[PDB]
Amino acid sequence: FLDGIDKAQEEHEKYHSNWRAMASDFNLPPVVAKEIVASCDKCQLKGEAMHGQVDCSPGIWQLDCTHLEGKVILVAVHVASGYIEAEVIPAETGQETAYFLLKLAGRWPVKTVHTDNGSNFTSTTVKAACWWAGIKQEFGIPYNPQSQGVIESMNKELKKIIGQVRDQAEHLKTAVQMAVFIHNFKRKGGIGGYSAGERIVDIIATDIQTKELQKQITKIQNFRVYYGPAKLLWKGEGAVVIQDNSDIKVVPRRKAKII
Amino acid sequence: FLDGIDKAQEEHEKYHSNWRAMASDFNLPPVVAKEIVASCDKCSPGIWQLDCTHLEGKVILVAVHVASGYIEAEVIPAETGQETAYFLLKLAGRWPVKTVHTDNGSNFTSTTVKAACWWAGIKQEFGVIESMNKELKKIIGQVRDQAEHLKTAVQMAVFIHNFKRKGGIGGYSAGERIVDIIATDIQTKELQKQITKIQNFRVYYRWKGPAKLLWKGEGAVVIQDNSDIKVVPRRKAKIIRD
Amino acid sequence: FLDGIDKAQEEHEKYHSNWRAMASDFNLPPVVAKEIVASCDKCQLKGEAMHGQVDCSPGIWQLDCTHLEGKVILVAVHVASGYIEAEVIPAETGQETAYFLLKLAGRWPVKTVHTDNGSNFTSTTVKAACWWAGIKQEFGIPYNPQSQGVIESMNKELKKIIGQVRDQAEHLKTAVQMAVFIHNFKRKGGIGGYSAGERIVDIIATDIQTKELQKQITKIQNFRVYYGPAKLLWKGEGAVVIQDNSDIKVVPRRKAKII
Amino acid sequence: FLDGIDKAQEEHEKYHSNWRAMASDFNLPPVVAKEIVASCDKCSPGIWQLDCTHLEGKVILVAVHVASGYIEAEVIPAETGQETAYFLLKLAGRWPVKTVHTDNGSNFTSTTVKAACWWAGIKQEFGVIESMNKELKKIIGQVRDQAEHLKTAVQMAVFIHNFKRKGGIGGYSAGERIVDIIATDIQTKELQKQITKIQNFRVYYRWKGPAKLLWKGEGAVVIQDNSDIKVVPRRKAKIIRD
Amino acid sequence: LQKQITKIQNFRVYYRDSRDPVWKGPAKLLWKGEGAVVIQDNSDIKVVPRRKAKIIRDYGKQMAG
Amino acid sequence: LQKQITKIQNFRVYYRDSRDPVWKGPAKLLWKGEGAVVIQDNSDIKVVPRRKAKIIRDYGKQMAG
Amino acid sequence: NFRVYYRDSRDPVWKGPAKLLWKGEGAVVIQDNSDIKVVPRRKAKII
Amino acid sequence: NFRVYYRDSRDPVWKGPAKLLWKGEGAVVIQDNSDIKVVPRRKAKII
DNA sequence: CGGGAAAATCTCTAGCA
DNA sequence: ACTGCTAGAGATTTTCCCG
DNA sequence: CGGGAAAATCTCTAGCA
DNA sequence: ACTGCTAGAGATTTTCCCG
Ligand SMILES: Nc1c(C(=O)NCc2ccc(F)cc2F)c(=O)n(O)c2ncc(CCCCCO)cc12
Ligand SMILES: Nc1c(C(=O)NCc2ccc(F)cc2F)c(=O)n(O)c2ncc(CCCCCO)cc12
Ligand SMILES: [Mg+2]
Ligand SMILES: [Mg+2]
Ligand SMILES: [Mg+2]
Ligand SMILES: [Mg+2]
Ligand SMILES: [Zn+2]
Numbered sequence A, C: 001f002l003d004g005i006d007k008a009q010e011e012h013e014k015y016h017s018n019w020r021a022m023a024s025d026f027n028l029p030p031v032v033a034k035e036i037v038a039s040c041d042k043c044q045l046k047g048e049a050m051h052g053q054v055d056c057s058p059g060i061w062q063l064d065c066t067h068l069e070g071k072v073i074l075v076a077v078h079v080a081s082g083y084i085e086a087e088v089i090p091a092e093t094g095q096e097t098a099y100f101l102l103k104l105a106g107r108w109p110v111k112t113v114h115t116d117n118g119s120n121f122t123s124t125t126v127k128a129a130c131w132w133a134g135i136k137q138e139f140g141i142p143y144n145p146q147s148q149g150v151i152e153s154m155n156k157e158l159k160k161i162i163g164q165v166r167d168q169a170e171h172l173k174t175a176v177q178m179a180v181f182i183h184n185f186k187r188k189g190g191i192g193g194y195s196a197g198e199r200i201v202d203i204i205a206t207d208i209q210t211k212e213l214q215k216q217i218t219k220i221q222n223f224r225v226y227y228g229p230a231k232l233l234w235k236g237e238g239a240v241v242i243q244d245n246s247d248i249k250v251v252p253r254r255k256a257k258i259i
Numbered sequence B, D: 001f002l003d004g005i006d007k008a009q010e011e012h013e014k015y016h017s018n019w020r021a022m023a024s025d026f027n028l029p030p031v032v033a034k035e036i037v038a039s040c041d042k043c044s045p046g047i048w049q050l051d052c053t054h055l056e057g058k059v060i061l062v063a064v065h066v067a068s069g070y071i072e073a074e075v076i077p078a079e080t081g082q083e084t085a086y087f088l089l090k091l092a093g094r095w096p097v098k099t100v101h102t103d104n105g106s107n108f109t110s111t112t113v114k115a116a117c118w119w120a121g122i123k124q125e126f127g128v129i130e131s132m133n134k135e136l137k138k139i140i141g142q143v144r145d146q147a148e149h150l151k152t153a154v155q156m157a158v159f160i161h162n163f164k165r166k167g168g169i170g171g172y173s174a175g176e177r178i179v180d181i182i183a184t185d186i187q188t189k190e191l192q193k194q195i196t197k198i199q200n201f202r203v204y205y206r207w208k209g210p211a212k213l214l215w216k217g218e219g220a221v222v223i224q225d226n227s228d229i230k231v232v233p234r235r236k237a238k239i240i241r242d
Numbered sequence E, F: 001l002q003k004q005i006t007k008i009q010n011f012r013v014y015y016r017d018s019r020d021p022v023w024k025g026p027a028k029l030l031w032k033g034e035g036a037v038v039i040q041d042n043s044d045i046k047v048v049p050r051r052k053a054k055i056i057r058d059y060g061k062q063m064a065g
Numbered sequence G, H: 001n002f003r004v005y006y007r008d009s010r011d012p013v014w015k016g017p018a019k020l021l022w023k024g025e026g027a028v029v030i031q032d033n034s035d036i037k038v039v040p041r042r043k044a045k046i047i
Numbered sequence I, K: 001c002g003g004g005a006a007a008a009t010c011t012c013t014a015g016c017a
Numbered sequence J, L: 001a002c003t004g005c006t007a008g009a010g011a012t013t014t015t016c017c018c019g
């Protein structure tokens, strides 16, 4: 068995065989075989099999510059809704990106901007523009396009829609604005059966209304809880949600008392 | 449900509340409240206003949502028809505009603007724009020094006037006001679609004569007959189309 | 309703809105909306969401030329097993491919060869070589790499293994042969817990043995069936498999009699 | 299972069949049959042979699997050590070679061939190659005209000698013979791995003394004690390691 | 007060778990804070981070709710 | 004869359906022809095309079968 | 009888409609303007 | 405590091992030879 | 019978130009 | 008339093994 | 209650340099 | 210390609607 481990290492240093081959050729149990493989530096070549989940708060947008017909289209998307804005800019430079971002901050209540590490978005001009508008910048991991998985997707969609109306407009900027119109107000689907624009209006209105209602309720409903004194959040017919020193927990009616 | 309908119609006969109030008070389906409102004889958000303003020798397009005060400005290079149509198409893509009330200028009546209005389905007409224009020029004069060019100054003034100037009744900024008005408009449009869908139906209950369908729940059906709203169990009334 | 259809078409010819938008804005039922969309030529832009299944008979191989370190490696794979052969060829021309394919036909019992539409495989030299060796050629769809989904995959694997032993060989051909060795005899897994070479030996031996046994059984077990006179295949305790004029069917014991 | 063990060992005491026959006759687990075979005192596939052959001024490496007759030839540019090591590494990657029996030539004893043998785990030694070489040269002489160069002729001769020349006992070609021999070798290796795994166990049954484990089924355990094979129910015997 | 409790309980929340990349069904928003949202899905109370919940008042509420 | 029936029933078949891209478990080869293969999986008889079945005699049969 | 839109060869633009000659599991063969083409079903919409 | 191998930036070659500073749901931040890098978990093996 | 350990199976992503 | 797949990594389910 | 129709939901691929 | 996603196409499950 120990001679098994010795021979297995002496062979893996040559062939680099996976744990099944070493467990089968040297009668090792799978644990020792995996421990042999996991200790080799060259046999670690494939990462995890998963996917993250991008920020989808109701106040974060995603920007990116795409290229179509030799022109540069700057595209931003409201992550939580899918309402996209787009504009054909003359050059993929910092000034145009800062101008478009200040426009977008004037139109809709943006609170965060998530971009790739393109020079357009990484510049001091978009940074000064974000500092003026109270916008928080959030760059993705370098060379990880999937981190902007929303906007890139919209890019595809946007381009496709241009491919349907490109012959209805002489120039390209007109076609891009028509594609924005079609994607926002003439293509329903999504979560609530809404179009994009209806969904973003609903998202923002619901954010405001829920903030107001929760503020009022928290102003009125003042109950200390014991289960250390936390804060009471919601108690209905079988459960109690408490907030214990920046840690929201949920308990049953048992193991909990209210004052 | 049965306890709420008579209460709501009696309350309306008392002091004629609105249908949203009845819906939020007695937990009624909005169609039933709309019908109760339409039972008494005694008982807009897409009207944008565009204009051009000269400043420092450059021309800015200003579009004011009349019902809210939300503003959209843009420095255009020349007061021509093409740029106006482009800006109007942008505004149509961004916000749900349904009618544009301009000032019969030399550019808003061009053929390109007319085409861009026929495409986006925008009706055209031919005094809130003056006060909002003066306010926007005031804010530009205030915040000009914080930028180098004029485009950035105009965009900063738009930002300030949309999300940093709270007034009116409840102190809501212009952005919150416009999103609330558009949410109300979406609610009205969805209710109208529901009414139009349910309108061309017919029901025969308990038998009895024809009646117009108002609501079709799980096992209950709320109908109207001779200006009287009734409820019945499902298997006691059969529905047909017309 | 009919005016609904008219207005819906007059609008879709402009905006090109999906069936949900036309069913929501004009009170059409989903069937009519889908019928409106499915009749527009520009709104048909995404095909099916599926994947085929490559030929995995025990007598079909897949060839492809990959590029590594500026050299051309010709790689063939037995589809049903995963046993790969590889050889560094001096140029991606027809003669080298024909020579390697004749080699592979001499070594293992190949009966079909599935390649992309590379000039190497499409040539008259590989065709004459396939005609001499009784090999049947089967080209994939042009510009559809997934049709060779096996070999391309192996390419990846092969390259990865080279990336583990490239510093154990001076030249590249030695490293490629070492990678073939490692992938065939020192990396178990697959379906039967085998390595590649053990699995191909099992595949071929089982093919031969099953052919022999089935030939003998068919020679002995001669029963006409009635359920039209078909041929009997297998009858066990609750079912009968018949072969009715090149159409294999399975029936219960009921609705079937044997002579 | 119990009815088969005594029958198989009595049959072996009768005329000493092989363990594969006992396994295929009484449906016994192969380990039990192997032990029954090892119960009587009275009761190879990786030996390749390489050589070089001159023809038309070019040298061809010929590797013959001794136990089957399957051949592998390759025209090499020069009878050097590097090309021999390359061909041997190819052959080691393709077929499960475990020993190479060469002819003590000037190239098969080089340091590069020795390195390629130490890498692939191939033992080296130093008369079937002559007859197979003469047969391969006969087939080359036959099929030479059907090709232009010599490489293609040699490969065609290899194809013919591997899959188009059936002889021997059952008329199986060389390819079928080698795949059957390698399948038998794989069976033997897997059985040996099973035996080696089960060997370092120990069992205590019904109590009783030590015993060596032979098979561990679902609820039955086949053990050996004092050269006598027995079967017991699982919960009547406990297993330990050693 | 109970009117506003029931009002804030009328909104709908679409959320995602930590390793579940498909959007869960419309829950019932029970509480919405600065960084977390307490919802009730199929009569099971959950606490989802703010960055994983789309909170909409589905205006297809003109038929039910 | 029954010996050879049982012999050909000892092999194992791994197959795939028409739209199922994952390899099904080891069935029991009942019959193997020129273009189709009749197998029995979980005591259900199936007929899979020859181009969708890997037929191996798993030499890990030295413990069971 | 049928209609088939396809994306043939490294050309992101779709084309059609084309008659459906034979639909097999995995790919179809279609006839567009006397041109007989083979297309994987992942790149063909059939109506 | 831990070891992390990563594939950083358009470089198919892997590298490591590197200390694991903070593992968050979606991506990790690691320290390889006084270099603090951020890497998506799809491109990082953690032992 | 029933809790952990362990083996087996399910899910899924990178890369194959 | 033709066609995505392979291997590893981690989560989840099923089996094993005594107590 | 129970068969079809219809709506809703699940699965999954292309493309986003 | 941060992160794949969106829409359509077809298969599959669940609801509806009278008989
Ligand atoms: N490479 C870029 C991609 C891209 O790779 N698309 C392929 C792709 C693959 C998969 C997927 F899900 C989406 C997806 F888009 C992109 O889309 N954008 O907008 C970029 N914008 C800017 C820069 C410059 C980076 C400067 C160097 C880093 O410091 C690169 C990119
Ligand atoms: N393009 C080729 C690819 C390829 O595209 N890989 C990317 C890819 C993507 C996805 C996937 F699953 C696998 C996969 F490999 C390839 O792999 N091989 O071997 C080729 N061999 C030869 C030709 C020349 C064709 C001549 C013009 C056609 O008449 C092209 C290719
Ligand atoms: Mg970018
Ligand atoms: Mg991009
Ligand atoms: Mg190729
Ligand atoms: Mg390739
Ligand atoms: Zn290693």
Ligand SMILES: [Zn+2]
Pocket (backbone or CB within 6 Å): B012, B016, B037, B039, B040, B041, B042, B043
């Ligand atoms: Zn009234």
Ligand SMILES: [Zn+2]
Pocket (backbone or CB within 6 Å): C012, C016, C017, C037, C040, C041, C042, C043
């Ligand atoms: Zn269309």
Ligand SMILES: [Zn+2]
Pocket (backbone or CB within 6 Å): D012, D016, D037, D039, D040, D041, D042, D043
């Ligand atoms: Zn004996």
